[PDB]
């Protein structure tokens, strides 16, 4: 599942989740989209569960585009140690996601299929979601 092949730094300070998404707000490849309604660190495992469920719905067919990527390392202190003695170990990777972002798109599939896969995928993600379909507003960006 998704993680950087290499990085300049092993650990990142946590930062903030303020604002609407910087970019990535319009459908850009496929026909239907899953857009984030609230901010979160989406984990690599959560992403992979969304993906796997979608290919599972399609059985064979369709194309899934994953548009968010987990490059933020997530740190945790070993169980039961006290505060201090330096930063915790990287235990996983997250993709920071703000409201408005198209996290996933699908193409090559019926409408009822794109809706359903995106719904099931939604249930794997720890935030609220909206399914969208490509508009002229998308195409003009």
Residues forming the site for Mg ion (CB under 5 A):
14, 21, 43, 75, 88, 92, 97-98, 101
Contact letters (x/-) for RNA, 64-103, by CB under 7 A? -xxxxx-xx-xxxx-xxxxxxxxxx-------x--x----
Task: Find the binder of RNA among 110, 128, 135, 139 (CB under 7 A).
Answer: 128
Residue numbers of the site for another protein (CB under 8 A)? 1, 3-10, 20-21, 25-26, 29, 35, 52, 54-56, 58-64, 78, 81, 85-87, 99-100, 107-108, 130, 132, 135-137, 139-141
Which 8-state DSSP code applies to residue 30? S
Q: To the nearest whole angstrom, how small is the minimum distance from the Cβ of residue 18 to RNA?
A: 4
Give the DSSP H or E segment for 112: helix 111-122
C-alpha distance across the termini of the chain, in Å = 30
Q: Which two tokens stand for residue 32?
A: 């239907």
- Asked if residues 34 and 113 have their Cβ atoms less than 8 Å apart, the reply is no
Write the DSSP assignment of 69-115 as a string of letters: ---EEEEEPPTTPPS-SS--EEEEEEEEE-TT-EEEEEESS-HHHHH
Residue 32's binding partner, choosing from RNA, another protein, Mg ion, none, with beta-carbon cut-off 5 to 8 A by kind? Answer: none
Please give the residues from 7 up to 66 whose contact with RNA meets the rule CB under 7 A. Answer: 7-26, 28-29, 38-41, 43, 45-46, 48-50, 52-53, 56-57, 59-61, 65-66
Backbone angles phi, psi at 45, to 5 degrees: -70, -40
């Amino acid at each position: 599942m998704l993680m950087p092949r290499r990085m300049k730094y092993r650990k990142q300070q946590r930062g903030r989740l303020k604002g609407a998404t910087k970019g990535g707000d319009y459908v850009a490849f496929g026909d239907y989209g899953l857009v984030a309604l609230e901010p979160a660190w989406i984990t690599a495992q959560q992403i992979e569960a969304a993906r796997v469920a979608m290919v599972r719905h399609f059985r064979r067919g369709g194309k899934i585009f994953i548009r968010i990527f987990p490059d933020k390392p997530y740190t945790k202190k070993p169980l039961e140690v006290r505060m201090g003695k330096g930063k915790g170990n990287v235990e996983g990777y997250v993709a920071v996601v703000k409201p408005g972002r198209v996290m996933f798109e699908v193409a090559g599939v019926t409408e009822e299929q794109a809706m359903e896969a995106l719904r099931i995928a939604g249930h794997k993600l720890p935030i609220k979601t909206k399914i969208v379909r490509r508009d002229a507003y998308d195409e003009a960006q």
